[PDB]
Ligand binder design. Sequence first.
Ligand SMILES: *[C@@H]1O[C@H](CO)[C@@H](O[C@@H]2O[C@H](CO)[C@@H](O[C@H]3O[C@H](CO[C@H]4O[C@H](CO)[C@H](O)[C@@H](O[C@H]5O[C@H](CO)[C@H](O)[C@@H](O)[C@@H]5O)[C@@H]4O)[C@@H](O)[C@H](O[C@H]4O[C@H](CO)[C@H](O)[C@@H](O)[C@@H]4O)[C@H]3O)[C@H](O)[C@H]2NC(C)=O)[C@H](O)[C@H]1NC(C)=O
Ligand SMILES: *[C@@H]1O[C@H](CO)[C@@H](O[C@@H]2O[C@H](CO)[C@@H](O)[C@H](O)[C@H]2NC(C)=O)[C@H](O)[C@H]1NC(C)=O
Ligand SMILES: *[C@@H]1O[C@H](CO)[C@@H](O[C@@H]2O[C@H](CO)[C@@H](O)[C@H](O)[C@H]2NC(C)=O)[C@H](O)[C@H]1NC(C)=O
Ligand SMILES: *[C@@H]1O[C@H](CO)[C@@H](O)[C@H](O)[C@H]1NC(C)=O
Ligand SMILES: *[C@@H]1O[C@H](CO)[C@@H](O)[C@H](O)[C@H]1NC(C)=O
Ligand SMILES: *[C@@H]1O[C@H](CO)[C@@H](O)[C@H](O)[C@H]1NC(C)=O
Ligand SMILES: *[C@@H]1O[C@H](CO)[C@@H](O)[C@H](O)[C@H]1NC(C)=O
Ligand SMILES: *[C@@H]1O[C@H](CO)[C@@H](O)[C@H](O)[C@H]1NC(C)=O
Ligand SMILES: *[C@@H]1O[C@H](CO)[C@@H](O)[C@H](O)[C@H]1NC(C)=O
Ligand SMILES: *[C@@H]1O[C@H](CO)[C@@H](O)[C@H](O)[C@H]1NC(C)=O
Ligand SMILES: [Zn+2]
Ligand SMILES: [Zn+2]
Lengths: 898, 900
Amino acid sequence: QSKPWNRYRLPTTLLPDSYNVTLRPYLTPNADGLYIFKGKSIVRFICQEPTDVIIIHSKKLNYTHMVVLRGVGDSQVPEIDRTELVELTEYLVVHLKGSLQPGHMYEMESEFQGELADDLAGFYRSEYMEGNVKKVLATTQMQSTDARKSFPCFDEPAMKATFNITLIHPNNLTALSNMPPKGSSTPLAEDPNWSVTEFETTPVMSTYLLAYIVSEFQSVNETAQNGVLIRIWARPNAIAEGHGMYALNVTGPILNFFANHYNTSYPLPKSDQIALPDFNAGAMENWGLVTYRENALLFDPQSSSISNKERVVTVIAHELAHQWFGNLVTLAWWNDLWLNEGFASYVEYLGADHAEPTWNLKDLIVPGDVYRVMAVDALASSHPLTTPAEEVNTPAQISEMFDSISYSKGASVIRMLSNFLTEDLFKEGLASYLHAFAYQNTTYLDLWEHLQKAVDAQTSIRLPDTVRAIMDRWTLQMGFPVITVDTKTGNISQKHFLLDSESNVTRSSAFDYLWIVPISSIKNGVMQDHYWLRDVSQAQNDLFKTASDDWVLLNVNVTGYFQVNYDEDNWRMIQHQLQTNLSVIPVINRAQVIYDSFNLATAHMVPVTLALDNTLFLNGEKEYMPWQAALSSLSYFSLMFDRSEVYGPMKKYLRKQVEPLFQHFETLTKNWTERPENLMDQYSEINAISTACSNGLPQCENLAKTLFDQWMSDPENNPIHPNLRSTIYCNAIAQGGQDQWDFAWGQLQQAQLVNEADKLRSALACSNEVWLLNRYLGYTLNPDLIRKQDATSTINSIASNVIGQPLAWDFVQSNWKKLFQDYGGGSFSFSNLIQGVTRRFSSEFELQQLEQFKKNNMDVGFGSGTRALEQALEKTKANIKWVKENKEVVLNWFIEHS
Amino acid sequence: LDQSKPWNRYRLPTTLLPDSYNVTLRPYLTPNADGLYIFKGKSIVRFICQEPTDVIIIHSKKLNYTHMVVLRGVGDSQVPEIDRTELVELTEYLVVHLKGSLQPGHMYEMESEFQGELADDLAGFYRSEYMEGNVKKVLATTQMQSTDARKSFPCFDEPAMKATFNITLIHPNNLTALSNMPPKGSSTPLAEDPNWSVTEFETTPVMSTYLLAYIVSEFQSVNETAQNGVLIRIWARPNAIAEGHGMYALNVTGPILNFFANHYNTSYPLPKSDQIALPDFNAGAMENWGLVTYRENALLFDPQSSSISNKERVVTVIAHELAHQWFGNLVTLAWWNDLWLNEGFASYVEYLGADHAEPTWNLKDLIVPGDVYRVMAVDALASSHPLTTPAEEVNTPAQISEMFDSISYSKGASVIRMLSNFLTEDLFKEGLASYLHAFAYQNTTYLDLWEHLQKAVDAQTSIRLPDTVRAIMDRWTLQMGFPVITVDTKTGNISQKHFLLDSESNVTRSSAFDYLWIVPISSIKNGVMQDHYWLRDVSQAQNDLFKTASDDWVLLNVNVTGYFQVNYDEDNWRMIQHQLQTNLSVIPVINRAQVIYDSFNLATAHMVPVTLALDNTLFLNGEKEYMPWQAALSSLSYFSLMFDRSEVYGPMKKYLRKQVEPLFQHFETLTKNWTERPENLMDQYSEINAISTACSNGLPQCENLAKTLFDQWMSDPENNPIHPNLRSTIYCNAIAQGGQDQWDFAWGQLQQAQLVNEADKLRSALACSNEVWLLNRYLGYTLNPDLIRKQDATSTINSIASNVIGQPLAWDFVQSNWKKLFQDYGGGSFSFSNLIQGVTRRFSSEFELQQLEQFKKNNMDVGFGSGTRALEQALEKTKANIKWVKENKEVVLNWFIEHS
Ligand SMILES: *[C@@H]1O[C@H](CO)[C@@H](O[C@@H]2O[C@H](CO)[C@@H](O[C@H]3O[C@H](CO[C@H]4O[C@H](CO)[C@H](O)[C@@H](O[C@H]5O[C@H](CO)[C@H](O)[C@@H](O)[C@@H]5O)[C@@H]4O)[C@@H](O)[C@H](O[C@H]4O[C@H](CO)[C@H](O)[C@@H](O)[C@@H]4O)[C@H]3O)[C@H](O)[C@H]2NC(C)=O)[C@H](O)[C@H]1NC(C)=O
Ligand SMILES: *[C@@H]1O[C@H](CO)[C@@H](O[C@@H]2O[C@H](CO)[C@@H](O)[C@H](O)[C@H]2NC(C)=O)[C@H](O)[C@H]1NC(C)=O
Ligand SMILES: *[C@@H]1O[C@H](CO)[C@@H](O[C@@H]2O[C@H](CO)[C@@H](O)[C@H](O)[C@H]2NC(C)=O)[C@H](O)[C@H]1NC(C)=O
Ligand SMILES: *[C@@H]1O[C@H](CO)[C@@H](O)[C@H](O)[C@H]1NC(C)=O
Ligand SMILES: *[C@@H]1O[C@H](CO)[C@@H](O)[C@H](O)[C@H]1NC(C)=O
Ligand SMILES: *[C@@H]1O[C@H](CO)[C@@H](O)[C@H](O)[C@H]1NC(C)=O
Ligand SMILES: *[C@@H]1O[C@H](CO)[C@@H](O)[C@H](O)[C@H]1NC(C)=O
Ligand SMILES: *[C@@H]1O[C@H](CO)[C@@H](O)[C@H](O)[C@H]1NC(C)=O
Ligand SMILES: *[C@@H]1O[C@H](CO)[C@@H](O)[C@H](O)[C@H]1NC(C)=O
Ligand SMILES: *[C@@H]1O[C@H](CO)[C@@H](O)[C@H](O)[C@H]1NC(C)=O
Ligand SMILES: [Zn+2]
Ligand SMILES: [Zn+2]
């Protein structure tokens, strides 16, 4: 560990200035069936401190000494002793016979070769059909640490430089990169069948934002209001069919919106958006060349759903948000990832709302992010938004940082921050921040300084403490408080929300798990004065003290990142209001009441009957979010109980509650022919239909059967509205047999819209026949049938089926080596797989099997799913206790109310 | 522990031998303050000293003593002082250390007083319970075999140590007391308390401890004196007797006893033979001399509600138990390593006795699907064992319990039938009569049997053998396994080799006979019998009997009388196939089954291409008889276990639908739309299988039938419209098609069932649900004695595991509840072994093997008791399954697709 090349962080002795990179992809296999790329690069770097070793990143590259070292101007150049590759720390190491001089620059040259693999990382290959022709293209994904997989570089985000990219490609293919082309392409001297395309120099930026693509893709375009050229690229067929039109509608105006909102121009002449058939995450914010999954950019007005449409605008908005938060201004290191991802996850709502103002999509942050992340942030094995820099060291640890904490808690905490500052004041602070650190890097402390500057120049908004004092507690310690109110005395208290008394908190907090909390409140339907709970375990205020015929609720619209519990009497008054006139309570807080009480019940802080009682009013609820809250909450109940005697009465209860909503949606939609007008009501319909069919409501089963029967009789004319397809497809396959399954499989393999393929993949997992589900699992590891990008999500879908649960858990264990080698170093997929197949575990036996699984595979380890496994273990232990203590009361409650 | 001390060895010393026992027992049929049911006892055993010893070692298990022993002399005997007494739990001994040695040639009497629990554990003196109206009834009953006599009173508890027994029962004055013998005089009030009475019984014959029985209950009886003067009584719950459920047993029991008496020229020596049905009982029945005990589904019968299969079970189990009166009771095995001398014989001559009571059934043929091919599946393993194992291998109680298996019962019956067949039963029974007369009230080994059979052979001329009886039968008895006989019909070349599954099969049990057999070979050529042949103990021979012209075919082992399987060259196989296609009638029906059985078994062991076996099912399209279809169903059952979670399953079910549909349609017509059963037993069995197969593979006509009838039953539950023969299938398929409504209805019927036959069909059918939550809830019930009797717990678990959806549920269930399962059944005949086998049957992957290995490792501390060999066989079979599935799955998939 005393040798620098055996440590995961680079030395500070050398800093890069600029790169020349030329890459040449071969889109046809050689004799060994390998797709390869060849490359050559020159990096210019400066020596800051004397050193006799050059340490630079290199991953899965073969060198054809491995480097040539030259000097810039004055520099005296030491001889190369030897060069070696250190694979563990992913280094190319150049041992010298003498030291480099400080203040002096050097240029290092290399020639290399790597595989154009189907692994979705570095420079990789993507494939599709066009008619009967197999097409292969070359594309990139550098984040987090795979730029090193395409050329040797100082591969850390803060070490910014300019890049001069050249692509050598077949003369009838299009070459794309971050910047526009520099002049025209020229024929490759040795062979005019190839062309050479040089691109303009990049801005000072991070290695992980580099991109370059060689394909036959086509585009549509428009110049945006701020003069920036927007293009939408995709497979020729998708463009011809008009599937890029929607992205073109929204991209430019959203880019222009952010520039104005943050008073900071986008400094590139273009922003390309491109849809790839093979892609790991949802998208990637490469500066000037934003890459996308097809289901995140393309859109078919006749075949895509309102949900698909919403995904497209928010992912685009998210990626464009990064152009400021990530690209222009970049985290100093991955331990501060939320500076990138937290902001993009919040700012995406702002951008998307600008493009689709009628949706009220800003409200979707509460189910989508706030309560999404609280499930994990309640664990002792969570982590704070900003982790200690030394905890984030290996590539696996970096990958795992891309989680619901960095994204969703980051967005939630930032919304709370915006809300008590006002967005007007917030964006002034952010503008100051962006201008000051443009083309550089930041930490969380830099953010506070510019927000504080804004608050101090300003007299209308007042705070109980400095921005840092308040925000350090939401940022540097994990978790969140439960705020408890005694409405008889107005006593208000706070404590760290934890699942168990068993929960063993070992991460020490310098802030003693106390927060400064912004508390809004509403009494008898009328807004009260704002209040700030200081960093103390308890306080008192008459705002929270009620008369016996009054009621209060705190955290209006759940702007604050916390949950609320009341005394039993105030809960009863809330319940009575929801029966008498639920309109008096804001719709989001109707959801809150369900979310919080179930979550409290999960942690045995309130009786379970409280949570269940809070769903009784849903009988007469039409609106999206309170129903969403109940479905999300009872989803945990299903996972715990859908293999027990509780399941029968639970479904009976759900049938009873949802039937009136189903009937409501049967009439207003005119027998399902006319969709509801606005987004929320369309979402409401989708959930009602899903719930009705999921819980066996006969009217829904017959609807699904009839529609799917009709489709099979006329395959070219799909009679099912896109909004309804996921439920109709699933229920019909569940009701049906092999005829339905094989039909849908045929539709899947010929699908020409990814949205539709996505729905088919999920519905196929709904079979009630073991042999079909197991045969399906077998397909997931066959790239001809299921793309690698979709393998884990399909496995998770099958595991969600109660009959598929043991099949998938067995499958995952038996195929672990392949699954780990393919995904175990990546973000999202691997972690989601582990969380997915272990969600149900609620017995000592299941826990022992998880522990045995862990022991069996310890030597290799669990890579970017290491924290996921720990959380999986903690949550199963908690589930064991909760099921044991809750089963009897829950069973009886369902029986009595159904 | 110190093996130099006799109280630390499992076998008793031979220094002391029992003469007679006095045993007084008093069951308390109401619990004490702690909720314990107990029994109190007093016993005196008289024994002789054969050789000088300063220690008395006697068996004792779970008894509390109130030293623990008083030792007295008979007349002259020099009586040593007792130094001290101790209980050694591991070897289940009461140990009396003496000052100086007992005197050889002289007798002693040893008295003890003791207490034990009347547990619900089905062993020793235990309790059984049932409802009568709204009153909970409790009774006391016994089960001593293999070695729980010691659990009721201290005794020399080994089968060869016979004695007479004077039993006294102290019981409530309004309950009936039964034992082996009739009462001696009247009952008398208990002196201290006339609410109790005292019943002394007549002295038993000289017999083994494991045959003792005594019962205290409210039961009633029907009776009849048999043709041989013996009183027969049928005992059961008062309500069962009142409804006439004991009548069929009364019809057949006496005649079967008289038949055996005459057949073996050996009279039954006791004045009575009681048969009694118990609500709680481990095995099928037990042959206690004078008081035969039974599961209710083995003795009782309702002509309106029981099936023909239920009927066949009753008469064959009774015949089996009565068979034991000679083979087991009168003449007893010397030690448990020769168990087949008891059980092989009872499993064979049960067919003879049942055929006497029901001669129209032709039930003797049922030995082929029931015993021969049943046991071959396991006897194909390196981890099998011979009929007679080395005595030193059968030592502990777990090992003794383990011997009660398909080898000792089913291979035993098969080999004995083979023996009977080549001696002729007339000659056989003459040798057996000589055997019984010579060893009456004593004990035997396999060698004693050959000697008397040989004497019969030598005293005649018409029947010829190629060697001594011992030379032939030692090879079938002392080494495990069986040969595959392979013939090249172009040359007449015939050869034999030990049948094993894999090329990795690791046989470590050495054979002094080099795994060669002397084999009786019958044959048929183009439908006409050929001269008989014996293959000698040689790996290869040649005979023109087995050489055919290209126009001819031959088949060996007519009616599968011999315990072996047969393979032919491909051209002879093709000729057989052509015969089956052209005119199947030319081939004897049992041999049509054999063709299927053998070809699938060879396919399983990679000895023939799988396509051969599958091709041999193509003619079933036009087959109407029971046994060839049974062969296919039993054979494809393995395919189902291997493939019902794979892409093969769809095409497999499709093929089976296609094949069974004409048979379904045949019976729909013949039975006049299912209203009239076929006349004979075999055709009734064929209908049952046709219906089961059609529904299980999703034939829509059958599915419609089951839903319609079950809907009709639910609309009028007191008038069940489903004929008993069809209930198992109809119930199952309706439950599978249906939901919670059907399940809860069936559960209600089960918990109010007054007939165990019906309860059994309901239990099995409830396991057919396709809803995980219903199956898992059901599993929870199986360890609740209020809902599922302990006697039915493991069979119910096995039914659920057979459901492809229930497989992971039951495997997890068994693993997570193993501690309770082991201490309840691990000691422990039939149930425990069956449970391990049932839940692991499907394993065919490296992952499943690893999981089974880990399971083994996890519980090695306690061990696996009477399921130890079963676990080793499970592991061996899993390993073979991995290889077979890997190498067969492609050909099997393509075959089913093409032919469906
Ligand atoms: C598949 O193979 C089988 C043979 O294994 C074929 O069956 C044979 O078919 C023959 C042609 O019909 C038939 O023919 C002739 O039979 C009777 C005499 O039969 C009686 O005695 C003999 C010997 O004892 C039979 O074994 C005996 O058995 C059978 O029939 C009984 C019922 O009556 C039994 O109940 C039954 O179980 C058993 O099958 C039988 O009792 C003669 O009367 C007959 O003469 C008449 O037909 C002649 C024309 O061929 C003649 O010219 C006329 O003048 C006169 O009307 C005689 O020819 C065999 O009996 C029969 N064998 C067996 C064992 O059944 C079967 O046909 C074939 N299947 C196909 C599709 O080809
Ligand atoms: C990539 O190309 C750019 C643009 O030509 C180069 O940037 C120049 O670098 C030189 C040498 O240090 C400077 O003197 C110029 O001011 C830069 N030109 C500009 C900013 O227009 C850069 O050196 C190249 N990168 C390399 C060679 O690694
Ligand atoms: C059980 O009772 C029998 C029959 O009464 C006893 O058998 C007698 O035993 C004596 C003493 O050895 C013999 O001399 C008689 O011949 C036996 N009578 C018979 C066979 O009718 C037997 O002793 C008793 N068992 C005991 C006391 O343990
Ligand atoms: C990199 O490319 C630029 C533009 O072609 C060129 O001027 C420069 O010399 C190259 N840098 C080197 C060779 O270090
Ligand atoms: C890299 O080198 C290794 C070892 O020579 C080889 O296995 C691999 O195929 C090479 N990859 C290339 C040339 O892309
Ligand atoms: C990171 O940014 C700071 C300015 O906030 C700058 O001083 C520092 O040099 C940067 N680090 C690197 C490696 O360029
Ligand atoms: C329920 O409360 C709302 C206020 O949000 C009010 O508009 C409505 O009139 C109330 N309902 C009734 C029946 O008055
Ligand atoms: C056994 O019982 C019989 C009958 O009561 C009695 O004659 C005999 O003495 C008893 N044996 C003893 C007490 O050893
Ligand atoms: C035997 O004695 C043990 C030790 O106290 C006791 O636990 C058990 O209940 C007793 N059994 C009886 C009295 O049947
Ligand atoms: C067992 O039977 C043999 C005769 O076959 C006999 O000699 C021997 O004494 C018996 N053993 C015992 C313990 O009675
Ligand atoms: Zn992002
Ligand atoms: Zn028996």
